[PDB]
């Protein structure tokens, strides 16, 4: 009957799913994983997810762990036809495009820039910084004349992207200097159901982990 | 009436789309882009794709450039209900999961390992090599007891992943040492319509670029 979500609150991809669940008003069985002490590396977790990451969604026989597949799965399953993931091909392709931009470009660049500094005491690399700036410039363009990032309505693309973009507040990347990004950030904060609990709470935990490590 | 695809044949994400088009028996208007001399950086191309990448699909008012959004778009548009991208949520989520694995893990790791060597004369990094091995080990697990990577039928996930995995033949990563990967590779080669033209031809061009640069 019930569906399990293995997660930690600090993790942006996890927050993408928490946001999507709030937007659909779902009741997932949240299962905190002790990443800090390698619970994800034990056989019982590998059974569910051999890539030993979070989040991992477990829906009876189905285990899936890419946040961006989970959020579209939740809509496809529970709210087929929702404006959060519209069925119109052109409209859907734009959402999908933004999701791939998120994983392959924005969050990847941020990850490349930031996590060496946090977990390997690396210095801040100017070139990697610039790659993040360019990702934000692209986002700022996507948002020119647009309320949301993939069409006129809030979509799973906004929720995934905001979970990523918000994580930048733990670093020295001033993303609010991009006017359209700043506008969109505020809009999504005030329109995504349960944002405080689904994203802001976890974001705070992430800032906590970051401070501790730095 | 007609739909444009800006591409170069050597590019794995481009080959993912060429494969998907062959599998759907579509007639795209192929438009070769002169990446080698920076045609993608000129204003006319930026207009279509500010991220200045290939492929870029242009369908009247719609421009989209993430290969993995394009291939699902082609199915959603022209063959809704196709086994190449099944509508069943669980079945679709598995395909989507594999697509995100492809961009965020397998191809990302390969890119990280290989392109510094090809375009920046970097030495081969053992650690980055190992990250690619681990991506292949994950693929090999996904394929345990399975003909295809995301269910019983050929899907856009196989086509995107094979475009990536095949690119490894230009490097020193022996992916065929993974028995399930080797089996799947062969199956897809012999079952994806137009594989020779959509993937192998371009793969050859890529090997050409690689040799030239090395």
The domain that holds A16 is classified in CATH as 3.40.30.10
- All residues of chain B having their beta carbon less than 8 Å from the beta carbon of residue A72 are 92-93, 96
- All residues of chain A having their beta carbon less than 8 Å from the beta carbon of residue B82 are none
Domain co-membership, B136 together with B50: no
Determine contact: A22 vs chain B, CB below 8 A: no
Domain co-membership, B22 together with B88: no
Strand partners, A32: A7
Instruction: Give the chain A residue nearest B86 (alpha carbons).
Output: A76
Residues comprising chain A, all counted: 214
Q: Which residues contact A155 (CB under 8 A, 6 or more apart)?
A: A83, A84, A85, A86, A95, A98, A148, A149
CB-based contact A21:A73 (threshold 8 Å)? no
* Token output for B183: 């089996």
Determine contact: A62 vs chain B, CB below 8 A: yes
CA–CA distance, B100 with A72 (Å, rounded to integer): 12
Q: Looking at A80, A101, A135, which one is the last position of a domain? A: A80
Residue B16 burial class via C-beta count within 10 angstroms: exposed 0-12, middle 13-18, buried 19 and up = buried
Angstroms from A104 CA to nearest CA on chain B: 6
Q: SS3 for chain B, per residue?
A: CCCEEEECCCCHHHHHHHHHHHHHCCCCEEEECCHHHCHHHCHHHHHHCCCCCCCEEEECCEEECCHHHHHHHHHHHHCCCCCCCCCCHHHHHHHHHHHHHHHHHHHHHHHHHHHHHHHCCCCCCHHHHHHHHHHHHHHHHHCCCCCECCECCCCHHHHHHHHHHHHHHHCCCCHHHCHHHHHHHHHHHHHCCCHHHHHHHHHHHHHHHHHHHC
CB-based contact B75:B20 (threshold 8 Å)? yes
Q: What is the span of the domain harbouring residue B71?
A: 1-80
B11 is catalytic: yes
Indicate the pairing of strand A56-59 with strand A62-64: antiparallel
Q: Which of B50, B89, B100 is closest, CB to CB, to A66?
A: B100
Instruction: Give the chain B residue nearest A141 (alpha carbons).
Output: B50
The gap between the terminal CA atoms of chain B, to the nearest Å, is: 43
Domain co-membership, B126 together with B162: yes
How many CB atoms neighbour CB A167 within 10 A? 24
Hey, of B78, B89, B95, B144, which one would you mutate to test binding to chain A, going by the most A CBs within 10 A of its CB?
A: B89
Residues comprising chain B, all counted: 214
Domain co-membership, B122 together with B162: yes
Domain co-membership, B141 together with B51: no
Domain co-membership, B60 together with B111: no
Residue B118 C-alpha from the chain's centroid: 19
CB-based contact A71:A20 (threshold 8 Å)? yes
Record the resolution, in angstroms: 2.0
Domain co-membership, B135 together with B187: yes
Judge if the upstream peptide bond of residue B36 is cis by omega within 30 degrees of 0: no
Domain co-membership, B95 together with B108: yes
CB-based contact B33:B54 (threshold 8 Å)? yes
Residue A56 C-alpha from the chain's centroid: 13
DSSP SS3 for A4: strand
Domain co-membership, B173 together with B157: yes
Determine contact: B96 vs chain A, CB below 8 A: yes
Domain co-membership, A112 together with A208: yes
Angstroms from A116 CA to nearest CA on chain B: 14
Determine contact: A79 vs chain B, CB below 8 A: no
Determine contact: A91 vs chain B, CB below 8 A: no
Q: Which residues contact A67 (CB under 8 A, 6 or more apart)?
A: A12, A13, A14, A16, A17, A55, A160, A163
* Token output for B203: 């793969």
Residue B29, CB-side half-sphere exposure with 13 Å CA sphere: 7
Q: Looking at B56, B80, B104, which one is the last position of a domain? A: B80
Chain A, window 154-213: residues with a beta carbon less than 8 angstroms from a chain B beta carbon: none
- All residues of chain B having their beta carbon less than 8 Å from the beta carbon of residue A127 are none
Domain co-membership, B20 together with B122: no
The residue assigned the tokens 């590019």 is B11
CA–CA distance, B129 with B106 (Å, rounded to integer): 12
Determine contact: A3 vs chain B, CB below 8 A: no
Indicate the pairing of strand A56-59 with strand A4-7: antiparallel
Determine contact: A100 vs chain B, CB below 8 A: yes
- A82-to-A10, A64, A139, B72, B112 alpha-carbon distances in Å: 27, 21, 24, 18, 37
Phi-psi region of A25 (alpha: psi -120 to 50; beta: other; left: phi over 0): left
CA–CA distance, B156 with B24 (Å, rounded to integer): 10
Domain co-membership, A131 together with A210: yes
Q: Looking at A29, A45, A80, which one is the last position of a domain? A: A80
CB-based contact B20:B74 (threshold 8 Å)? yes
Phi, psi values for residue A172, rounded to 5°:
-100, 15
CB contact under 8 A, B108 and A104: yes
How many CB atoms neighbour CB B213 within 10 A? 12
Cross-sheet strand order for the sheet of B4-7: B29-32, B4-7, B56-59, B62-64
Q: What is the CATH number of the domain that holds B184?
A: 1.20.1050.10
Helices (H) and strands (E) in chain A, counts: 10, 4
Q: Considering its fold, how many domains does chain A have in total?
A: 2
Q: Which residues of A are catalytic?
A: 11
Angstroms from A189 CA to nearest CA on chain B: 26
Q: Which of B50, B72, B90 is closest, CB to CB, to A96?
A: B72
Closest by CA to A202, choosing from A160, A168, A158, A167, is: A167
- All residues of chain B having their beta carbon less than 8 Å from the beta carbon of residue A108 are 104, 108
CB-based contact A9:A201 (threshold 8 Å)? yes
Residue A189 C-alpha from the chain's centroid: 14
CB-based contact B35:B45 (threshold 8 Å)? no
Determine contact: A106 vs chain B, CB below 8 A: no
CB contact under 8 A, B92 and A76: yes
Determine contact: A92 vs chain B, CB below 8 A: yes
- All residues of chain A having their beta carbon less than 8 Å from the beta carbon of residue B101 are 51, 66
């Amino acid at each position: 009957m019930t569906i399990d979500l293995y997660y930690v609150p600090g993790s942006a991809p996890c927050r993408a799913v928490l946001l999507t669940a709030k937007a659909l008003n779902l009741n997932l069985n949240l299962k905190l994983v002790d990443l800090h002490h390698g619970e994800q590396l034990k056989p019982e977790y590998l059974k569910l997810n051999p890539q030993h990451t979070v989040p991992t969604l477990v829906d009876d026989g189905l285990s899936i762990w890419e946040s961006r597949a989970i959020i579209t799965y939740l809509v496809n399953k529970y709210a087929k036809g929702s404006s959060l993931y519209p069925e119109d091909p052109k409209a859907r392709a734009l959402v999908d495009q933004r999701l791939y931009f998120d994983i392959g470009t924005l969050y990847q660049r941020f990850s490349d820039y930031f996590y060496p500094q946090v977990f390997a005491g690396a210095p801040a690399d100017k070139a990697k910084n610039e790659k993040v700036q360019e990702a934000l410039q692209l986002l700022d363009k996507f948002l020119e004349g647009q309320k949301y990032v993939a069409g006129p309505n809030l979509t799973v693309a906004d929720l995934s992207l905001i979970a990523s973009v918000s994580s930048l507040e733990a670093s020295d990347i001033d993303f609010k200097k991009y006017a359209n990004v700043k506008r969109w950030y505020e809009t999504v904060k005030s329109t995504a159901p349960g944002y405080q609990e689904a994203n802001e709470k976890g974001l705070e935990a992430f800032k906590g982990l970051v401070n501790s490590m730095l």
